């Protein structure tokens, strides 16, 4: 197809391999622990699952600066390559000990956390303003589809074969994809070796009216404004529940619901598939709402954020109420994750609604602060649930629901959407 849609497809596969390499461990740890198996304790498993988010936190904002400086192509390609090779060496790191695996996961976090800003730095030069929505949607849906596919796929490989083949498969697939990314993609349409003249003129002429402003991202602004911290804490509360689910759901099904590894992998993707299919309709629902009602822009934000952050909390509480039920617990979990889909138009769009031309930096700040739950939630949750502890699983579900409620309340108490009065260049 066209050059920019080729970039969109290759970005889709890139993010598919990013989230895969992120999530394959959450399924591999189900079989990698003893009742080749290792005698890892509950606290160790939490650290091993959470070590990735240390690197993801560390390399986020410097990754954005480097992407702005030297561009997206090489930076993202090398991030993916340095995640794939570390995944390939993870099985031998498991034999060397717990410490080697933790440092492997930390280095994977450092490699992988630069991917998102490197992609935004490419779409700052590739996506025309009229068409940015479709391109960003196609590019970023790769992450969600990556989780949705890599859960059952990891389960299938981990059941039919040993768990090491999961890591080998994803590592070799990452290397193979890098062999395409280094070749078909370029930093900027002027630097593209094969783009047609008319497409290049279209992209440049459409981006001219924005790049002619010459005032985008001139400094690190004074981010004292409370409306930024309200959306930051909303993102924190959302990511807390999302990552607590992502890093524990296969473990939860193995430990409480007692599903087989294959069935565990199949069922673990249902909540995220539901979340994807709800998020994709959420934009159309928001358009339908905007088409009729005289609501202010803040109104749709607050209603959608409340729905998408409260529904998951109440349904996670409900899943706590009838835990150990092989049929109803998974239904409540998938309903929770599906209701979580409204959060995009609830608060994720607010990042660029309250401050255009600063979205790439403000969203990076918010994502740096909101990946603290990736480091905190998994380890404390695994510490709180030592062996079976249906009561402690209820306890962690209550903790996640309370965090969601706090985030929704704080966001709705301080959400603004016009202008921060300093972002107006
Ligand atoms: C609102 C849409 C366009 C954004 C969405 N992006 C996405 O990557 O979701 C994955 C999940 C998430 C959901 C909502 C807000 C933040 C996050 C996030 C951050 C880090 C890792 C995973 C996630 C899309 O375009 O489909």
Curated annotation (Swiss-Prot):
Keyword annotations from UniProtKB, A to Z: Amino-acid transport, Cell membrane, Cytoplasmic vesicle, Disease variant, Glycoprotein, Lysosome, Membrane, Phosphoprotein, Symport, Synapse, Transmembrane, Transmembrane helix, Transport
InterPro entries assigned to the protein according to its UniProt record, in alphabetical order: MFS, MFS_dom, MFS_Na/Anion_cotransporter, MFS_trans_sf
TM regions (residue ranges): 7-27, 47-67, 74-94, 96-116, 138-158, 165-185, 217-237, 266-286, 303-323, 329-349, 361-381, 395-415
Catalytic activity: N-acetylneuraminate(in) + H(+)(in) = N-acetylneuraminate(out) + H(+)(out); D-glucuronate(out) + H(+)(out) = D-glucuronate(in) + H(+)(in); 2 nitrate(out) + H(+)(out) = 2 nitrate(in) + H(+)(in); L-aspartate(out) = L-aspartate(in)
Result of altering residue 73 to E: In SD; alters intracellular localization, only partially targeted to lysosomes and mainly detected in LAMP1-negative vesicles and in the Golgi apparatus; completely devoid of L-aspartate and L-glutamate transporter activity, but retains appreciable H(+)-coupled sialic acid transporter activity
Cytoplasmic side stretches: 68-73, 117-137, 186-216, 287-302, 350-360
UniProt GO molecular function: carbohydrate:proton symporter activity; D-glucuronate transmembrane transporter activity; sialic acid transmembrane transporter activity; sialic acid:proton symporter activity
Keyword Glycoprotein: yes
Localization, UniProt: Basolateral cell membrane; Cytoplasmic vesicle, Secretory vesicle, Synaptic vesicle membrane; Lysosome membrane
UniProt keyword annotation of Zinc present: no
GO biological process assignments: amino acid transport; monoatomic anion transport; monoatomic ion transport; neurotransmitter loading into synaptic vesicle; response to bacterium; sialic acid transport
UniProt GO cellular component terms: apical plasma membrane; basolateral plasma membrane; cytosol; glutamatergic synapse; lysosomal membrane; lysosome; membrane; plasma membrane
Lumenal topological intervals: 95, 159-164, 238-265, 324-328, 382-394
Entry comment describing in which tissues the protein is expressed: In the adult, detected in placenta, kidney and pancreas. Abundant in the endothelial cells of tumors from ovary, colon, breast and lung, but is not detected in endothelial cells from the corresponding normal tissues. Highly expressed in salivary glands and liver, with lower levels of expression in brain, spleen kidney, muscle and pancreas. Expressed in acinar cells of salivary glands (at protein level).
Membrane topology type: Multi-pass membrane protein
Pathological association: Salla disease: Sialic acid storage disease (SASD). SASDs are autosomal recessive neurodegenerative disorders characterized by hypotonia, cerebellar ataxia and intellectual disability. They are caused by a defect in the metabolism of sialic acid which results in increased urinary excretion of unconjugated sialic acid, specifically N-acetylneuraminic acid. Enlarged lysosomes are seen on electron microscopic studies. Clinical symptoms of SD present usually at age less than 1 year and progression is slow.
Recorded family membership: Belongs to the major facilitator superfamily. Sodium/anion cotransporter family.
Protein task: Multifunctional anion transporter that operates via two distinct transport mechanisms, namely proton-coupled anion cotransport and membrane potential-dependent anion transport. Electroneutral proton-coupled acidic monosaccharide symporter, with a sugar to proton stoichiometry of 1:1. Exports glucuronic acid and free sialic acid derived from sialoglycoconjugate degradation out of lysosomes, driven by outwardly directed lysosomal pH gradient.
Protein's recorded name: Sialin
Source organism: Homo sapiens (Human)
